[PDB]
Design a protein around this ligand. Structure first.
Ligand SMILES: Cc1ncc(COP(=O)(O)O)c(CN)c1O
Ligand SMILES: Cc1ncc(COP(=O)(O)O)c(CN)c1O
Ligand SMILES: Cc1ncc(COP(=O)(O)O)c(CN)c1O
Ligand SMILES: Cc1ncc(COP(=O)(O)O)c(CN)c1O
Lengths: 447, 447, 446, 446
C-alpha cells in the first residue's frame, strides 16, 4: 500500500500544520482486539485506546453485527418535533435506567463530546429561563479542564493552547484552580488541605459574582487531556455541597470517565456524587460510530417541560441526534461493558499498572511523578525535580520517548510534557506488563 | 411492537417539550428507496428525505457494503497530530478533487453540519491571526439564515426562535436582510432591484463596522430552514465581489445545497461563485453515518500552514474527525451521486414538481406562494394575500395540513408557516406526482 | 504667545498627527454671544461653545451665584446619608420643571456622557429590581450620538467613534434613522418614512425578543449626527411601541434640553414623555460641568421598593450634586425661563433657516440645510443626484469654516456638515450676520 | 428648613429604600478642615469631602482664581483645532510635574471615572495604532476600585458595584491583591505574598496569551477597597512583569495622586513609572470637577504616528479642558507644592496611625488598622481569629460613625471598614481629635 508517499489533503487535529512536520504520519491500517498495525505491517499495543474510546477493543463481532442489522432496517431517520424511531427509544430508556442513581430523566442525543458539552451549556441557560431566573448566565470551570472545541466548550476550557488562535468567545466564563497535588498555587501536597483551599476559593468567587448570575459549574471527575489530574476524594463531594448552597447546576463531563475508565460506571458516582447533568461520548459506542449524549435530571427536566410560554420550546438539536445506527451500536457496546465488568477490570489492572510504573520515578530524573485512576494515567516529565517545571514540548523530548515506546511495540500519547496511557478497558495483566516494559525501554533510550 | 404506549425518555429537537404535545410520536420503523413505514405499518413517501440528507435513498446496498468492509478492517482510529489511517486520505483527496474548480486545498473533518459551521467560524479566526490581522473577528450573516446550533452557529442564525432560550451568545455578529422576494423591507418583487437593495445594505454595514474588523460572511446558497429562500441570480455573484473588495472571507454553508439538491454539485457553483470556505454535511454520507467537513481554499490553507509561531498549530478538531467508517460510507455515496447524475435529476424533476404545484396558489387562499430550486421547495402559507402575513403555527393549521398529506401517503415538514418539500434526489417523475396529489388532498381537507 | 507653544494636550475629535495638530484657534475671552481670540479678533459664537453656552458668555448673575456658593461650601459629597443645600434645591427644581414627564428622582453627574452611562446602568438596575434580569439589550438609532464612555460609545450610531477602540458592550442594536434626505428606502415622504422605521423597530423587537430588551435611547433631534429632524409622528409611535413591550425610552436631551429646538424638552416638543431624561450642556450653560439623569415615578418606585440588594444604588460620582455647579444651574434656569429662550430659539431659528435656503440654490456643494429652533446643519455633498457626502479628508468643509470665521462667525464642521448652534439669546440681526458670513464663505470656498 | 424637605435626588452608594432613604446629614458650610451642618454643629472633616478636599475648604486664592477666570472665559471647547489659555497652562504643568514618569500628553475630563474610562479606551487605541488590534483584554486587582462608568465598573474588584447592572465589558480578568490581613494563601510574610501574587500574574498571562492583553490597571494604594497598602516590592515587580510582555501599566492615582500617601504619586513612592496616570479628586481639591489621564512618550509617539484613521482621537468630552476647572487646578497645585502637602501627610499620617493602635488593643471589634500617609482604615470584624468582616447591613459601622460625628468628627463607613481621609493640611492637634472621637465612638457603639 502506497500511503507512505501520499499527499495530505486533511488537517490533523491538535498538531502543527507547518512543513515539514505536517508531512510526517504514522498511518494505522488495521485494528483487532487491543492491537493496531500500521501500513508498514508493524504491530503495537494500542496504549491510547484510539482516543480513550475504543474501550471494548477493535473488531468486536457483536457490535459489527448490530450495525449491519440496523443498516438493513433503517440506517437513519430524524427525531425532530413529533417524529422518532425505535432505536432512540431503546437507548434513552437504557441510559436513564443506568443512571437512576443520579435521577437522570431526559437525554438529548448528539454525535460527540463537544456536542454534549455545547448542549449542556445552552440547555443549562434554558433551565434557568424556564425557572424564571434569566439572570443565571455565567459558567464556572477548572484550570486544565477540557470540554471540547465548539465555541461554548472552548470558552470554558482551562488550557490556553486551545484558545490562542480563535479570539474572544463566550463572555462571563470563570476559571477555578484545580485540586492538583503536583502543581498548585499553595505548593500543597496534602489532599484534605488542598481540597479546602480550592473550595474556599470557589465560595469567594461565587460571592464576588453573585450566585444569582451563575448558571452552572462544569468539571471532569478526572481531568483527562489536562494531564490525568485525579482530584482528592473529598473534592467532588464538597463541590456538590457548594453548588447546592446556591442552586448552581453541577455538570459532570463524563466524556472520558463515562462507562468505566476510572473504576466506576461514572466518575461522579465513583466519588459518591450525583451531578445535575451528564456529558457522554467516546466509549459510549466504543468509537465504532460517532455518538454523544447529554442527560438531564428530573429537577431540570421538570422545569423545562413545565416552562411557561416559549421557555418549554427546545430549539436545540442535530440532524444526527438519535442516529439509529449509532444507537444500535451503543446498545451492543453497553452490553459488553456490563457483562465483562469493564469498570471492574479498569480498577484492578490500572492499579497494578500504576504500581509497576512507580520505580520509573526514581530511575529517571525526567520522570516527575506517575498518577492515575483506573485506566487513565499520566507520566509528568519535568526539567527540575524540585520546582516541578514541565519539560518544554518544543524541545521534542516527550515525543521522542513516545516514538521509542512505539518501536518497542506500544503506542502512547504525548500531550505537552506528559505521556498519556489510556488503553482499552479489556487490558489484561499481560498487556499491562508489556506497556511497562516498552516505557522502561523508551526512557533508557530517550530519558 | 409496543412502542405506541412506550415511555419517552428523550427530547425532540425543535419541538415543545410540554405535555400533552410531548407524548405524541410518529415512529418510523423501516426505510427502502424513497419510502418509509411507521410502527403501524403505514407506508408513505419520504417527502422530507430524512432531514434533507438521505439524498440517494434508504437501504442502498453499496453503501452498507462499504460500511461493513471498513468495520472488518478498522472501524475507528484517531487522526490527531501525526496519526491517521487510509480512509481519511482517500476522502480528503476526493473532496479537494471534486472542488478543484473552487481551488479547495484542505479539509477539517467532523460529524455534522453544526460542526462544519463552528469549524469554519473558528478557523476563519485562526486564518486572520496567522495572516497577522487579529482585529478581523466579527461575523456577518443573513436574516432567516440557519447554521446549526452550536454556540457559534447559533450566534449567526437569522431566526429568533433559536435565540430566545439561551441568553447572550457570541458578540460581534451582525445580521443583514435576506434577498427574499415574498417578504422584504422594500416590498420589492423585482429580483435585480432587490439584489441592489441588499448589496447596498451590505456595503453600508461594512462601512459602519470597518472592513478591518470583519472576518467572514456566512450564507446558504439557498436558505433552507429559513423557508427555501432562493436568492436572485445576481445576488451571490455580487456577494463575492463585495467580499473581495474588502478581503472578507466568504463561507458557503452547503450543508443542504451541497452535492446536488438545488441543481448543482455546489449551490455556490450553481450561482457561478467560488467561496473561500465550504461547510458540508448531511448528503455527504446521505445520513448513513454522521460526517461533516469544512473545506478551505489554497489562500486560507497556505496562510495557516505558513503562520508564524503558534498560529500554525491547529488546536481544533474532534475525536471522530476523519472517522474511517464514515469516510468509507462517504466514498460509496459520492460514487452514486456522480454516477447517477443526481444534481441533474434534482434540477429536472424539481422543476417539474415546482411547476405542478403552482395551481395550488390560485386554488387555495391559504397558499401564498410556492417557490423552490431543484428538490428543495416550500409552500408559504398566509392568512392574507395582500399583506402576505404568515399563518401563525400556534393555531396549528400548517401542522394539520402536514398531517393530512401523511394520511394521503407523503410525509412533509411544517416549519413555522411553511410546508417544506425536500425528498431524496433520486426522486422520479412518478414520485413527484404522488407528492402533488397528497398536497392537493391536504389543502382540500385542511386548507 | 500661545501661537508657537508646544501642545501637551489632545484635542477631542481631531487628528493627532503632525503637522495638523500644531495649529490652534486659541479663544481668549467671551462676553455675550461673542468671543475674542489671542489675536484680538472677535467673532460671533455660532457654535455656542459646543451647543451649551445657551445664555451667552459672561452673565453677571450666574458668576454672582458661583461666587456666593464658593464662600459657603464649594463642595461636599452626597453619598449615602449626606448632602448639602444646593442639591436639594436643584433636584426639587428639575423635578418641578418636568412634572409633565412624571420625573421623580435625579442622579447627578458632570456631563452628557455621564448622564447617558447613568441612564444605561440604572435601566439595568431598574429591571433587576423588577425581577427581570433578562432585560439587558439596548436599541439606538443610526447617526445617534450619546457620548464616549464605553456604554454610550456602544450605542453610538456613527462608525468614526468605534474604529479605534475595539469590542465594547455586547447586545447593542442599531436602527435606521427617520432621515428624509438619506434612508434605506429612498423614501421622500415623512409619513411613509416613519411607517418604514416603526415597522423595522417592531421587526427587530420580534427578532431579539422584547423580554431581552432593556431600553431604547434616542435624541429628539439628532445633533452631532447632522441635525436630522424626525417626522412629527415618529416620537409618538416610538413611545407607543416601547409601551407595547414595557421597554424603557431614554430621551437623550443633552443638546435639546432647555430650549434649543423650541421647547424645554424636545420630547415634550413632540408631545412625548420618556421614561428617562439625559441632561447636560445647557443645564449650567457651560459655566460649570454638570449632568443629570432623571427617572420617572415608574422607575423610582421599582428600585426603591426592590427586594434585598436591588434597592442599593451603587452608582454615582464624587462630584454628583456638586454645590457650586448646582448654584450655577439654579441661576441659569432662572434666565432661561425669564427670557423665554425656547421661544426665541423657535422664532429666530425659523427665521435663520429661511434666510439660509438660497445657499442651496446658489452653491452646488450645498445639498440641503435643515433645522428646528437653533440647531441647524448644512449638508455638503459631492453630487446632487446621489447625495453622496463630501469627504472631510479633502478638507473643503474645514476651509469653508475658516473663511466664515474670517468673516466674523465661528461655525463647526462635522464630517461633511456645517453645524450652526449659537446661544439661544441670538437676535434677529445676529442671525443676519451669520447668513452673510456663510454666503461669503461659500463664495470663497464653495 | 431642609430637614423636613422632600428628597428628589438619590444618594450614591446607599439604600434608596424608605425609611433609610430620608435620613440625612445636611452639610451647610465648610472652612479649613471643618464643616458645619444645618444645625450649626461643626465637626472635623475626617473624610475630606470624598478624599479630595485636600487643601481644605474655602481657600481664598483658589476662589480668586475661579472668579478671575469666570470674568475672562468661563468656558470654551477644545475639540479639533480649538483651544484656550488655561488648558495649555495645565497640560504643560502636569507633564512637567511628571517628567520623571515621562508623561507626554494629557486627555482632560471631569472626574475619576472619566479618567479611568479614558485610560482604557486609549489603551485600546494605542495597540490599534501599533498594528496589534488583538490586544483587547484588561487586568486588575481584587478589591480594586476604579469608578462607575461601564468600563471602570467592568474592572472593579468589589462585587457590590456589579450586582445590579448585569453583564458589562468582556475580557477583564481579576488578580488577587497583596493583602497581608486577608489572602488566599493566609500568607503573613510580605516578601512571600508578593511572590505568590506575581507568580499568579505570570500564570494568568500565560493562560490568556500576552498578545491578547492590552493593559493592567491598579491603585498604588487601594482606597475604597479598604486602604490596602501593598508590599514595597510588589509594584516594582508589577512594572517588570508588564514589561516582559509590553502590557501597559495603568496607575489609578485618583486618590493617591498629589500626596495623600506621602508622595506626589503613589507609584513614584514605590519607585515605578507607569505608562498611564489617572488623576482626579485632589487635582482641583474638589472646587471644580476635573479629571485627567496622562500618557507617556511611548503611547504618544505611537498614536500620533499611527497610519490612516488610527491617529484620529475620537474620544473626549464637552468639558475636556474646562478653563475655570483648569484655573482652579493651577491654584491648588501651587498650594500642594508650596505647603509640601505630601510630606505633611507622610508625617501626620504616621503619627495618626501610631496613635490609633491603642484602639486595636482595646476593642474586640477592631481587627486591624492600616494606612500609609493620610488614608487609613480601621477593619471591623465579628471574630478576631477568622478575620470575618462585620456585615454592613447590620448597621454597626454606621452607628460607630454616627457617634464619632456626635463627638465632632465626620468619618466614612465603607462596608466593614471605617475610612479616615482628612485634608492633607491636617495638624497634630486635629489628628489627636480624630483619635479622641473614635475612642468615644467605640466606647459607645463598639
Ligand atoms: C473530557 C472531555 N470533554 C469533551 C471532549 C470533546 O470530545 P469530542 O472529541 O468527541 O468532540 C473531550 C475529548 N477528549 C474530553 O476529553
Ligand atoms: C444550512 C445548515 N447548516 C448547518 C446545519 C446543522 O446540521 P446538523 O444538524 O447536522 O448539526 C443545518 C441543519 N439543518 C443546516 O440546515
Ligand atoms: C446628544 C448628546 N448626548 C451626549 C453627549 C455627550 O456629552 P458630554 O460631552 O458632556 O459627555 C453629547 C455631546 N455631543 C451629545 O450631543
Ligand atoms: C481609585 C479610584 N478610581 C476612580 C474613582 C472614580 O472617581 P470619581 O468619583 O470622580 O468618578 C474613584 C472614586 N473613589 C477612586 O477612588
Amino acid at each position: 500500500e502506497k500511503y507512505k508517499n501520499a499527499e495530505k489533503k486533511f488537517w490533523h487535529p491538535m498538531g502543527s500544520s507547518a512543513a515539514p512536520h505536517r508531512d510526517k504520519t504514522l498511518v494505522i491500517a488495521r485494528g483487532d482486539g487491543n492491537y493496531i498495525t500500521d501500513i508498514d505491517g508493524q504491530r503495537m499495543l494500542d496504549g491510547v485506546g484510539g482516543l480513550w474510546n475504543v474501550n471494548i477493543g477493535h473488531n468486536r463481532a457483536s457490535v459489527k453485527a448490530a450495525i449491519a442489522a440496523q443498516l438493513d432496517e433503517l440506517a437513519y431517520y430524524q427525531t425532530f418535533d413529533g417524529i422518532a424511531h425505535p432505536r432512540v427509544f431503546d437507548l434513552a430508556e437504557r441510559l436513564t435506567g443506568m443512571f437512576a442513581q443520579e435521577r437522570m430523566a431526559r437525554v438529548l442525543f448528539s454525535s460527540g463530546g463537544s456536542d454534549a458539552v455545547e448542549t449542556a451549556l445552552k440547555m443549562a441557560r434554558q433551565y434557568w429561563i424556564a425557572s424564571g431566573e434569566p439572570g443565571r448566565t455565567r459558567f464556572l470551570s477548572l484550570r486544565n479542564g477540557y470540554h471540547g472545541v465548539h465555541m461554548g466548550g472552548t470558552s470554558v476550557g482551562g488550557n490556553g493552547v486551545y484558545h490562542y488562535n480563535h479570539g474572544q468567545l463566550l463572555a462571563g466564563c470563570h476559571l477555578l484552580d484545580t485540586p492538583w497535588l503536583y502543581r498548585n498555587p499553595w505548593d500543597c501536597r496534602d489532599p484534605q488541605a488542598l481540597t479546602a483551599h480550592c473550595i474556599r476559593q470557589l465560595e469567594e468567587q461565587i460571592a464576588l459574582l453573585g450566585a444569582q448570575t451563575i448558571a452552572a459549574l462544569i468539571a471532569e471527575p478526572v481531568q483527562g487531556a489536562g494531564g490525568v489530574i485525579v482530584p482528592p476524594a473529598d473534592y467532588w463531594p464538597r463541590l456538590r455541597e457548594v453548588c447546592d448552597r446556591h442552586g448552581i447546576l453541577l455538570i459532570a463531563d463524563e466524556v472520558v470517565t463515562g462507562f468505566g475508565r476510572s473504576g466506576c460506571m461514572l466518575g461522579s458516582r465513583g466519588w459518591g456524587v450525583a451531578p445535575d447533568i451528564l456529558c457522554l461520548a467516546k466509549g459510549i459506542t466504543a468509537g465504532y460510530i460517532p455518538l454523544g449524549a447529554t442527560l438531564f435530571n428530573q429537577r431540570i427536566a421538570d422545569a423545562i417541560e413545565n416552562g411557561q410560554g416559549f421557555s418549554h420550546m427546545i430549539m436545540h438539536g442535530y440532524t444526527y441526534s438519535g442516529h439509529p445506527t449509532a444507537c444500535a451500536a451503543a446498545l451492543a457496546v453497553l452490553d459488553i461493558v456490563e457483562a465483562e465488568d469493564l469498570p471492574g477490570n479498569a480498577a484492578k489492572v490500572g492499579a497494578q499498572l500504576l504500581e509497576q510504573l512507580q520505580p520509573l520515578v526514581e530511575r529517571y530524573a525526567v520522570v516527575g511523578e506517575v498518577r492515575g485512576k483506573g485506566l487513565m494515567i499520566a507520566l509528568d516529565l519535568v526539567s527540575d525535580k524540585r520546582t516541578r517545571q514541565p519539560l518544554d514540548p518544543a524541545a521534542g523530548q516527550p515525543s521522542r520517548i513516545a516514538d521509542e515506546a512505539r518501536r518497542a511495540g506500544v503506542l502512547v500519547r504525548p500531550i505537552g510534557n506528559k505521556i498519556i496511557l489510556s488503553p482499552p478497558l479489556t487490558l489484561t495483566r499481560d498487556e499491562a506488563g508489556l506497556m511497562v516494559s516498552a516505557l522502561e525501554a523508551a526512557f533508557a533510550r530517550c530519558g
